């Protein structure tokens, strides 16, 4: 998370290290996002900074609009597809990896999200749940 996130997030299973190519599910024009950094990672030797649902990552657009390529931008993960664990006992995971484009302040760049977003991201970022469809 970092600065600008409302509330804390319980730790779930990390599934997205640096170098992962997720999808981009909105009307911003970007097709995929390439993870180069994770906000709030550890400084331990020989650990790739891994991400999860609701984490704020730095992404680079590889496929999509040419205006969005060759630049660094923040991103918020909305689908993880790694089997994490909630406290009530369910082991749930999405089908693919996905994220949205965002500013360093936390506001959304797009207007809609064409896929499902889990409640660990919809309760941590209020602007994602305002443009999402069905939760979980």
């Amino acid at each position: 998370s970092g600065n600008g996130a409302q509330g804390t997030k319980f730790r779930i299973s990390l599934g997205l290290p640096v170098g992962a190519i997720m999808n981009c599910a909105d009307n911003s024009g970007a097709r995929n996002l390439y993870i180069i950094a994770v906000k709030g990672s550890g400084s331990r030797l020989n650990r790739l900074p891994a991400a999860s649902l609701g984490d704020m990552v730095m992404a680079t657009v590889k496929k999509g609009k040419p205006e969005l390529r060759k630049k660094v931008m923040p991103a918020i993960v909305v689908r993880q597809a790694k089997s994490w664990r909630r406290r009530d006992g369910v082991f749930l995971y999405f089908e693919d990896n996905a994220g949205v484009i965002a500013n360093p302040k936390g506001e959304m760049k797009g207007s809609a999200i064409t896929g499902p977003v889990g409640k660990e991201c919809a309760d941590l970022w209020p602007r994602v749940a305002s443009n999402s469809g069905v939760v979980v």
């Binding site: 509330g7 804390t8 319980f10 406290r87 009530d88 006992g89 309760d123």
Partner: peptide, 20 residues
């Protein structure tokens, strides 16, 4: 064994919600 109980922790996010 795995036991379902209620979390009696006010101020948390799963207050009055089942945890295992």
């Amino acid at each position: 064994t795995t036991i379902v109980r209620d979390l009696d922790r006010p101020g948390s996010k799963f207050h009055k919600r089942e945890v295992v």
